[PDB]
Amino acid sequence: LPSQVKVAIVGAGMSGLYSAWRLQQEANCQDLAIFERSDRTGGRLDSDLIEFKNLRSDEPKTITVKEEQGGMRFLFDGMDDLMALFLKLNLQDDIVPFPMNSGGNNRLFFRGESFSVSDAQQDDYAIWSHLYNLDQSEQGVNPKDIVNVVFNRILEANPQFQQRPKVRGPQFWQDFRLECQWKGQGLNQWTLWDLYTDMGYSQECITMLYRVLGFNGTFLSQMNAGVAYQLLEDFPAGVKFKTFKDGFSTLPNKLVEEVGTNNIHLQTTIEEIDFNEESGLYELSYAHIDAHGKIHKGLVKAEKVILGLPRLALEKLFVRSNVINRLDQDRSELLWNTLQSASNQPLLKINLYYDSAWWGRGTTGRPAVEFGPNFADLPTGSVYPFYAVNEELAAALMYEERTTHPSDAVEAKLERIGNDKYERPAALTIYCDYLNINFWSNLQNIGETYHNPKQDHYVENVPDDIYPASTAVVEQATRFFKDIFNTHYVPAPVLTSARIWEGSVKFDIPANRQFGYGVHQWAVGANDKEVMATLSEPLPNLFTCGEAFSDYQGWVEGALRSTDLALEKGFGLKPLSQAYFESTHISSSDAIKAVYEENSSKLINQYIET
Ligand X SMILES: Cc1cc2nc3c(=O)[nH]c(=O)nc-3n(C[C@H](O)[C@H](O)[C@H](O)COP(=O)(O)OP(=O)(O)OC[C@H]3O[C@@H](n4cnc5c(N)ncnc54)[C@H](O)[C@@H]3O)c2cc1C
Instruction: Give the residue ranges of the annotated binding site for FAD.
Output: 15, 36-37, 44, 72-73, 270, 547, 556
Name the binder of 125 from Cl ion, ligand X, its own copies, none, CB < 5-8 A by kind. none
State the burial class of residue 449 (Cβ atoms within 10 Å of its Cβ: 0-12, 13-18, 19+): exposed
- Is 241 a binding residue for its own copies by CB under 8 A? The answer is no
Query: Which residues are registered as beta bridge partners of 521?
Result: 343
CB of 25 closer than 8 Å to CB of 571: no
Name the binder of 378 from Cl ion, ligand X, its own copies, none, CB < 5-8 A by kind. its own copies
Q: Of residues 22, 44, 304, 311, which one binds ligand X by CB under 6 A?
A: 44
> Which residue number, 87 or 178, has a Cβ lying nearer to its own copies?
178
Q: Of residues 358, 549, 555, 580, which one binds ligand X by CB under 6 A?
A: 555
- Is 344 a binding residue for ligand X by CB under 6 A? The answer is no
- Is 204 a binding residue for its own copies by CB under 8 A? The answer is yes
Compute CA distances 73 → 23, 53, 69, 245, 342, whole Å. Answer: 27, 27, 12, 11, 23
Q: Of residues 143, 310, 418, 503, which one binds ligand X by CB under 6 A?
A: 310
Give every strand in the sheet of 374-376, ordered side by side. Answer: 113-116, 107-110, 374-376, 381-387, 426-433, 347-354, 495-501
**What's the half-sphere exposure (Cβ side, CA atoms, 13 Å) at 486?**
20
- Is 521 a binding residue for its own copies by CB under 8 A? The answer is no
In angstroms, the CA 556 to CA 254 distance is: 15
Residue 170: left (phi > 0), alpha (psi -120 to 50), or beta? alpha
Query: Which residues are registered as beta bridge partners of 298?
Result: 286
- Is 194 a binding residue for its own copies by CB under 8 A? The answer is yes
- Is 189 a binding residue for its own copies by CB under 8 A? The answer is yes
- Is 153 a binding residue for its own copies by CB under 8 A? The answer is no
SS3 string, 233-267, reads CCCCCCCCEEEECCCCCHHHHHHHHHHCHHHEECC
In angstroms, the CA 69 to CA 351 distance is: 8
- Is 508 a binding residue for its own copies by CB under 8 A? The answer is yes
Residue 156: left (phi > 0), alpha (psi -120 to 50), or beta? alpha
Map residue 41 onto helix, strand or coil. Answer: coil
- Is 344 a binding residue for its own copies by CB under 8 A? The answer is no
- Is 14 a binding residue for ligand X by CB under 6 A? The answer is yes
Beta strands in 60-166 (DSSP E): 62-68, 95-98, 107-110, 113-116
- Is 322 a binding residue for its own copies by CB under 8 A? The answer is no
Compute CA distances 126 → 118, 120, 145, 208, 354, whole Å. Answer: 12, 7, 14, 14, 35
Contact residues toward Cl ion (CB under 5 A) are 55-56, 101-102, 104, 106, 117, 200, 207, 482
- Is 94 a binding residue for its own copies by CB under 8 A? The answer is no
Scan residues 467-506 and list those touching its own copies (CB under 8 A). 472, 475-476, 505-506
- Is 546 a binding residue for ligand X by CB under 6 A? The answer is yes
Q: Of residues 7, 8, 9, 11, which one binds ligand X by CB under 6 A?
A: 11
CB of 17 closer than 8 Å to CB of 45: no
> Which residue number, 16 or 570, has a Cβ lying nearer to ligand X?
16
- Is 439 a binding residue for its own copies by CB under 8 A? The answer is yes
- Is 30 a binding residue for its own copies by CB under 8 A? The answer is no
Shortest Å, Cβ 327 to ligand X: 19
Shortest Å, Cβ 63 to Cl ion: 6
Shortest Å, Cβ 495 to ligand X: 19
> Which residue number, 205 or 347, has a Cβ lying nearer to ligand X?
347
Q: How many residues bind ligand X (CB under 6 A)?
A: 40
In angstroms, the CA 569 to CA 540 distance is: 11
Q: What character string, x for contact with ligand X (CB under 6 A) and - otherwise, covers 260-299?
A: ---------xx-----------------------------
Q: Which of 97, 455, 42, 438 is nearest to 266 (CA)?
A: 42
Output phi, psi for 384, to 5 deg. Answer: -115, 125
> Which residue number, 135 or 391, has a Cβ lying nearer to its own copies?
135
| Residues found near ligand X in the complex (CB under 6 A) | 10-16, 35-38, 43-45, 70-74, 269-270, 308-310, 313, 317, 347, 349, 501, 516, 518-519, 546-547, 554-559
